[model samples]
Every structure is written in structure tokens, then in C-alpha cells.
Target: HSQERPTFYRQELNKTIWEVPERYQNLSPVGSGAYGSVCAAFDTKTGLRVAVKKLSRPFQSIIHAKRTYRELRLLKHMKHENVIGLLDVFTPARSLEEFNDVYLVTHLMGADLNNIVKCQKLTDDHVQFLIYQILRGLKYIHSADIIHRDLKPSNLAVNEDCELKILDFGLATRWYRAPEIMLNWMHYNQTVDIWSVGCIMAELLTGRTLFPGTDHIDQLKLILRLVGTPGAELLKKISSESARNYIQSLTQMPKMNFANVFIGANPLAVDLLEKMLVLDSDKRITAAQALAHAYFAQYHDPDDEPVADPYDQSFESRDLLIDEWKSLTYDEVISFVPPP
Candidate 1:
């Protein structure tokens, strides 16, 4: 064991267990989120520091496994400057019988926007650049017909150069939750992602979270309070009549002028926010439309903002067993490793 790399790596981080590859060492907590934790480490082979994140008992249930699969599969497909890069994926368990966790290695980022927002003094250019990159990345994801359901733009990774990369997948918290989703909508689209970005942009301009609601119920009210209630046309689209009626019951709120809401912010930026923070899903701005918005005129470069092929979500329907997921996921893990 002196110099030879072991077949496995094991460690405990903030009450969670991790089983990754031997090449990553000097594990230190970068942060954690709803599902799992992330740590910064030295990648012996890559000769750079990288982030090692655990899936947190991925195989504990088929539901968890499916989400885990989607993250890894999507990560493998997605490639963009403002999107998190999947460097390597592995499992420490030697045999499928023992495999229980999935680890993803990514380049270590300096800090999340949440932290950056609190400390860093950002100029108008900084806000524009940050929001533009986010929209750029979302354009790529949305082009693939995939909705990043829980895009906590605040949790985004950024370096000293102000290059921001989107991260995390699956469910969201009350803070970033879209109004339609909170209104009991069964099916939603990419507009939800835009809504979150809108909140993020507002937060970027002002160092406070735009909609810090108390609960799921409060979340919709919080949005409605800011943007005003949806009209009959939009309310009719609600999957639940109860949700629709609930909105109708509330006294309509007069729309808050964007310029007034974000006092002293650029008129273009306020225009973008007004379009995004709308109640109806259709009324919300699409990422492409967002990129084309005059606010982003300075930083917008269509040449570099690329699109990807549609992601095949067909695998989502198949309810595979835990072992089946392990088999398929294991196959994917080794696919990243160079064969002898």
C-alpha cells in the first residue's frame, strides 16, 4: 500500500459517506446540497484540483437511481463554458453486488454565486456578464428540449474570471421554485428555467434573494405579489382547478414597474426581468429570447453560444430495478476510463 494506488477510495464528509476513485486526494468540503455533498481534491492523474461529489446512496431506491442516472447521462452529453464539466465518474465498489454510490469528478470552482453575491462588489458589467453566461448555458440545455427543473442559479459555480457554470439537478427549494410548478401544474416546460434565471438576475442586481417564500403555498403568492396575478387565459392552463381557483380568489396585485422594483438598474436589464418574472409560463422569456434581449447586447455572442442535439429522455420511463440501474450505471462509469 506504500505507493500503489488502491482499487478504491473511502471517506466520511459532513455526516455523509463517499466512495470514489483513488486518484483524488486531500478531500475538503467545498459545499453540499439537497441530495449530496461536494469536496475539493487534488487529482493525481490530471495534475489539478477537482471536485469529487457523492450521489448519496444512489442505489437506495429506484427513484434515486433514476435521478442519479439522468445527472450522469446529462453531464456526459452537456458541453459548454457556462455548464459544469463532468471530468470523470467512478464507483469504489469492485463488484456490482457491492456498488452503492456514484461519484462524479469535476473541476473545482472558486465559490458559488451565493457566496460571491454576499462578499464581492459587482458592477453593472459584472451583472450583465454573469447573467449572460447563465442564459448562454440555459440556451444550450433548453435547445436539447430538456428542462433543468431545479436551476438554483445562486448555487452556480464561478471562478475569479467571473466564468459561471450551472450545477445541480433534480428537485428545487421554495426560493427558486417557479409559480406554475407551485400552482400544482403537472407538466411544465423550459420556461421554468427562465423564471429561476429572472429571480437570479434580480438577486444579482440586489444582493438579496428575489423570492424567499415561506413554503410551497407562499412561493406562488410571493411571485404573484411581485409580478401581479395571471389572467384567465393562463389560469385556465393550470392542471388543477383548485390551483386555478386559488389564484382567482386572491385580489389582483398591480404590476410593479421593473424600473421602480430594481431601482437604478439598467432599463434593458429591467425589461428582461419583467419578461422573465411573468406569471404565465408562455409569457416568460425563452433563453434564446433572453440572449437576444438588448440588455445582453454587449456580451452576447451568437457565434460562441452553441446548441446540442435533443437529449433522449426515453430511458426515464423504464422503471428498472436497483440491480438493473447498477448494471447500466456501472457500464457508464467504466466507459470514461481508458481501456487496457
Candidate 2:
């Protein structure tokens, strides 16, 4: 039971109706996200290619709608070189009752880091630069008390210039999850992202996933085997006693020497990875600390690694109804006037 729209540029793709603004032209299908489907479009207003992401079923549930709101709130005030910027937001619906879909516009990149790793044999310099950019962008996010909950390779966008920007802020379940999360510790921190970076860096070095596990148990097992078990003092940081006792039951092992595993890779790079991949979150290197590591001494600049102000989390607790969410989102879309 599909209805017709008198105004917006509407397209029927895979039975999903996409209604977008007039200024965004030449729409073509692209890959999707956990929250939405995306398309490549040319922005006539700015003369640049852009990605228009149409959020899926945002209003049906509060969880989905809140993420949509959270995403917008973070992107609206974010201003940095390595972080993706939000150009515009729109909806075809005229009012709260009418609002059903939201379209987000962001700059399109050449490829994601995962695709690049698959297709190209990256040079040492390339890997360092790419990682530096990731850390730089993350520094901004972390300083703001934002965890960037999902930071896998696919969530990183890169171009031919070697410049990289983070893609998704949605969230995650498996792979690259910290040991603390693996142990079912509910309270976690930004250090989880650092562990993810370590995993990503290792992938960059070998073009392979460091922990190719079949399941969550296998994931943690692989990490324990490779990185070794956490010491008792470090395990203290894990609040769950059962999880602490659980680690005590496993056979202890020594960590793989990063220098040996990543043969021919820079020693400084290896050193940084060792620190980042530490068993305990408390000892893991932070984004700011990673940037200052000896590995990045040449490229690191105090001025270049800009920090961001913390995001206002007022809406997180707001359990507003669907109509209120629609009104708030509509206001967000309307506020996106041409750049001053």
C-alpha cells in the first residue's frame, strides 16, 4: 500500500520509497548501514558529490529514534579535519504527523579502509598516516567523552590522499570488542576504542584480521592466547568477580612479541601496538597518548591534533513520544540553511 508524493524527488528502489530534496541530484544506490540505506548523489548547491543516508524505521522504536537524534546532535557541532562533517539533514514530511523519514548528507569518500586493505598493499608510510588520522579524529571524539562505540575498519572512510575520517558512530556487538566487554563487564570506557585501533593497526600491517574468531568465546580466547592473560592487579579493574574468577581458570600465556609477529614493520609502530593492545583497559594507550608515542613523533603536531568540546547529552534521557521526536527532527532539518 504505497502512497504517492506530489512534491519530493521520489524513487522506488527494492520496494523502499526514497523521497529526497530537489537540490540533491543524480541519485544512485550505495551500501547501507545498521540504521539506514545510503545513495550517492551530487549536490547541485555545492557542486560536490555526497552520500544521502535515509534512516530506516527510526520512529517505530525509541531506541532507533534516539540513535538518529544522537547522531545528528554529535555531527551538528563536530568540526575537524579527520572527522566526517554533516552538510545537511532533511525530511519529506511536513509536520510531526507527516514526518516518517530522515535523510542525512555527508561528503563521499573514495573507499572504506577495509576495501583499501583488500585491494592495495599499503606502504609503511601509508599505514602510519592512516592510523595517525584515525587517532587524531578519535582524540577529538574521546576528549568530548564520546566513545565512538563502533570503530572497525569498515567504519573508517579513506581517500587517495591518504586522509581518513571515521564513518559510523552507531555501535557494535562483536569483533574488536575489548576484553572487558568480552568478560561481560557492563561499565566500560573509551579505552575500548584504543583496543579496536590496535586490532586495526595489526590488520594494516598484515592485511588480515588479528582475531579471526568464530564466536565471542573464541574471540576472547584468541586475544588471550596472543596478548596473554591479564595480571591479578589489572584484573581488579574488572568489576565482575565471576569474570575475574573466570580469567583465573584459563591457562596463562605470554604475549606474542609485536616485533616478531609484525616482522619488517617499524619497531616504533610495533611498540605503540603493544601498549594499545594491553590486556587491561587501564593500561591501554589513549588516543592522545598514542598520538604522542615515538612512532608518530615525525607526523604528530600539537596544533594538528585538535580536541573537541564534549557533546550535550540532554536528549539521551528524553523519552519523548513519536510526535515529539518528529518535531525535534523537523526542527533539525529546517535549521540546515546554506553555509553562512
Candidate 3:
């Protein structure tokens, strides 16, 4: 029979395992995620640094293999410093085997936005830069008709140089298929990604997940709190009336402006974020439009100097780290202003 094509499989797939390639054997493991093992490997041939990911097994079946292959094709063709560039693919030296022997390679990374925003409080300027890079990457992906289904900070990585790379396309599905892809429901469009972007952006500004609900219902509630509940007029445009009704039944819907929530947030940052997280997906700002926003233009050229703080370099809250603002409370974060 002819080799089967890869397609979406509902189960966790497996990969064939074998000896590590000579070029990547001793490299240290840096991070791991839902996929498999990732290591910081060095190129013995050119002394360059790269990240190598080893799949756990051959795809569960031909269908799964096709999906994996599609992801690889997308990554290979998509190129940008902000988007993780596929460097190379490698196979084991041994005879033909399933998943274990396959590997996907990409460029090395330094830190993700989570590490900076949560672990180390980022300054207004630093936050601006981070947001800009994300928008740029999203613009590139959207232009190609690809939707990044998953876009949390943990899925992203940055270099010490502050160059952001959107990692992990394994979770991506066509934007039109997002609802079905995420929840097995046949209703959704490109806006699903914009929703994820909103969540990530909120977390970037507050150093906390925008919605911390434990379950799907709770997650929706959590998200609704940040983005006001949808109104009847807004609901009319939904392609899935069932999905609209599901959203409409919610009890409490706050209509507060996000800008006021992050009162002391840089005006430019707040402006860009509001557009990205609009209640109606149809009204949501496009990535290309964000790239053209005046805010990014304001910081067209940025410097790489790490903003200095007075406390230990390991401080979590920016205010606590600065001697002058050390005693501020959580509610007082907005009042803790930075010096010019």
C-alpha cells in the first residue's frame, strides 16, 4: 500500500527513538512542553547554536503523521526572527523505524515573555518592545492565512537580545476551523487567535493570566471579565447561533475600558491592546493594522540596555525592586510611577 498521509488524530502520538545525532548528543535540555523533549544543541559543523526537538514516537497513525507534516511545512515556509525559523530536520542513522528517530530543529532562544513579565517586572518601555515583536510575528502568520491557535507566553521564547520568536505550531489549525479544532465544535473563525492574543497581551501588562478559571466555563467567564460580555447586536453576527446563545447566558458582563484597568500603563500600549481585544472579532484589529499603529512608530528604534532596578535582580514586582517605590501595594501599582 502507498504511505498514508498525515491528518489530525485525537490521541497523543508517539515517535520512534534512537541514538542522538553526533551533532547534538551532549547538548543540554533547556525546556520541555506538551510535545516532547527540547535541547540547546550546538552545531559541530559551524559552531552555531540551535534548538533540537525529538518527537516521542512515530505519529499515532497515518492521519497524525499528515498533521505533523503539515505543521513542518508551515514552519519551514514561514520565516521571521520573531517566528521560530525551522533550521533543519534530521533522522537517525539506523534502519527505517517509526517516530523515535525523527527530529525537528530550530534556532536557540533565551527567555519567554512569562519569565520577564511575571518573574521579573518589565518596564513600560520593555513591555512596549515585547508587544511590538508579537504583533509583527502575528502579522506575518496571518498574512499567510495561518492562525496561531495557541499563543500563550510559555509557547513563546525570546533571546537575551530581546528578539521574540513565536514557538510551537503543533497546536495550530486553520483559523476557520478553530472552534472545532479547540473544542470539537463546528463554529469559529480567524478571531480565535485574536482571542488568544488578547489573553497573552493582558498577561504581558499585568504579569498574571487574564483569566484564571479552572474549567472551560470558568475560562470563558474569566475572559469575559476582561473583555465585556457580548451584546445582542454583537451576537447577531456570530456564525454559530448556539455559540452566541452560550455566550449570552452569562450572568455578569462588565463593560469597563481596559485602559482604565491598567491606568498607569503606557498610553501607547493600552491603545494597541484595546484594538486587539475588541469584543467583536469582526471589529478586532488585524495584525497588519497593528504594525502600522502610531505606537510602534514611536519606538521605531529601541536600545538593548536592560532597565536598571535597585532591588535584587530577581525581584518580581518592578515597584518593589526600586528603592523609592518598594512599599507599594498591589492596588497601588498604578500609582507607582517611573522617573523620566
Candidate 4:
């Protein structure tokens, strides 16, 4: 009888908890990825539908830990309407020892840009508004000196009303990544993200990837095919010896006609795209500049106030070790109190 009593208590500890917090209910699976799963749930307290993401194996490795931290920290600090806002964050664990999974609650969106592109129903109006929102979001992000690093169509969440919000900073990598980042330059800037925006915009217009390459070399080849080979001066600036040498060996290619490629597209929109997809990161158009372009002239308001940069310019250069990353992430997680 004594043994049975202790066994019952231990069973309670190991038993799975099916229910989330009382404030949220009726969770239905929405999506899944390497890091976590997302679900649509009704927030009973606020009487709103919210999408909740559960971070899987958040602290499983140093890389995973750092990613989790960056996503949460950035989302918490960024207060732009075009950027994904962190509505709530919670851990199911009752104590530090039991804590592992981290959940994030964000505003529910109907679909992603990828779905819209696939549906093939986007109008010129939809294209302008979508790209405008993306640029607006990027303007705020770049103002903060944060390069989104990853800006694919799938990452842009959208609703039927045509509102777009950027999400997913975990796969911030260098695969057909920015030319500057791919070259492993000593420093890269917000231009890397602009390149991605160019890619996203192209996809929206053409319903296909602008630069579809199997590998880094293939990606470069595809880019060259369309944009032409970079000049010797730009090639020489590449930090990677192999990459520079490879480019030097390739035959020079002529730039393609943007008008011909983007069939039936507006000249102004095509012109803006050309400016954004430049090989040289320094030459790429800034988000603020993109927003001002004639492509969005009808939509842009001259009286619109600029977003203030929330971070110091030097924030990009702050390199931290793995242990420091862990400590910083832990501190952020513990100190965070969700807003009402």
C-alpha cells in the first residue's frame, strides 16, 4: 500500500498534460518545421484567434539556443505593424528544471506569400501592395540595423486583407545568400536582406524563382545568366579566394532585358527590381529608397514619418562566444514578461 502511494505520485509527474493554459483553448495544428510546430488557438481571455509556435529542442544545441534567443529577442523588441509581433510567450514547465519547450503567440494570418504566388490570382494591385508592405517592414528592420538574412516567400505571412508580416529568422544562412555573406566578407550590411527582397518580388511577379540554383556555385551561375558577370573590380573585392577565382574564370555574360523577362510588368516596378538585385551589396537600393520609387508612388505618402532605429549601429559587430550566447538567451527568457 505504501509503495502504491509513491507510485501514484510519480505517475502524476510523468503523465502528459494535454491542455495548454486555461486562457487558450481549441488548438489545431497549423504547421511544423525543424525547430517547432504551430497551432491555431482561440485566446479565451482576449477573445481572439492566435497562432502559437512551440520551440522544439530550443536548448538542444548552441546553434539552436542562439536561434531561439534571437527570434524571441527581436520579435519582442520590434514594434512595427508590418513585422510579426510577439503577443505572448509561455513555458509549460512549473520550474526551471522542467522547462524545455517555449511557446510564442502571434497574430493569426490567413496564408503566406508562397501560397499566394502558387494560386496565381494576384493582381497588379496585390503585387504593389504586397511588395510595398515588404519594403515597409524591411525599412523598419534595416533602420534597427538588423538584417533579416532570410526573406523567402514562405516567411512572409499574409491575410485576405493583403496585410503582410515577416516571420522566421532561424534559417538565417548563406545559401544563395547575399553575395557579400556568401563571400564571407569581414562585414555585411542590410543590403543582404534587400537582395532577398528582390528575390521575393521577382517570384511574386513571375510566379517562379528568379534564381533557382542547386548549390552556391549554381546559384551564382544563375545570377550571372540573368544579371551578367560582375566587373573585375567587384570580383576582386570578393573575400573568398575560390569564389573570386571561379568568377574570374567564367566568361563574361551580358545583362538580360528586364522588360522582356518581366512580361507585361510595369517599367517602374521592373526598374525597382533591377536596382535591388545588384551584384554589389553596396549598390543595392535601401528599403526606404524602394518605398519612394515610382513603382509605389501612388501608395507612398510623403508625410509618413520614418521609423527610429532601436539599436545602435555597432550592434552588428558585437560577436559573442557560445557560452555568452547561452547566458544572454537564458537571461532574456527569464526576464521576459508578456505584455497585456
Overall lDDT per candidate, in order of appearance: 0.79, 0.80, 0.58, 0.73
* Clash totals for all candidate models: 0, 0, 19, 0
TM-scores of the models, in the given order? 0.83, 0.88, 0.69, 0.80
Runs in model 3 lying further than 4 Å from the true structure: 1-25, 29-36, 92-100, 169-187, 239-254, 299-340
Give the per-residue lDDT of model 2 (tens digit) for 1-340: 4544335788875348888878888888877656678889998879999988888888777677677777777778677888888888878887667778888888877687876678345777877888899999999988878887668877888777768888774312467777777766656779889999998888887777888888988898889888888787887676777867887887888887778888888888888899999987878889998999888877899877888876777887778876677667677766765343
TM-score rank order: 2, 1, 4, 3
Model 2 CA deviation exceeding 4 Å by range: 1-17, 31-34, 94-98, 119-121, 169-173, 337-340
lDDT per residue (tens digit) for residues 1-340 in model 3: 5542222112112232334446554466665565567777786755668777766533554434444445555555566657776666654422222223346677666667666555444677777688778777776666665666666777678767777878764211221122233454434555666667766666666766566666665565555677778877777876787887787787757766877887877787788778776666677777766666777775443342111122122222222222122122111222222121
lDDT of 1 by residue, 1-340 (tens): 2653256756888687776667888999877776788889998987889888887767778888887787788888777788876888877677777677788887887777776677344577889999999899899988888887778855688778878898774212668767766655657878998888888888878777788877776766677788888777777676777767777888978887778888888888888898998877888889998898899889888888899877888898898887787788887876764312
Superposition TM-score, candidate 4 onto the true structure: 0.80
Cα RMSD, each candidate:
4.3, 4.6, 17.7, 6.7
In model 2, state the lDDT of residue 197. 93
Q: After superposition, how far is residue 83 of candidate 2 from its true place, in Å?
A: 2.1
- Top candidate on TM-score is 2
What candidate 4 gets wrong by more than 4 Å, as runs, is 1-19, 32-34, 59-66, 92-101, 119-121, 169-176, 180-186, 239-242, 302-309, 312-340
Best-matching candidate per lDDT:
2
CA deviation > 4 Å runs, candidate 1: 1-22, 29-38, 54-56, 92-101, 119-121, 169-173, 216-218, 238-240, 337-340
Better of 1 and 4 by TM-score: 1
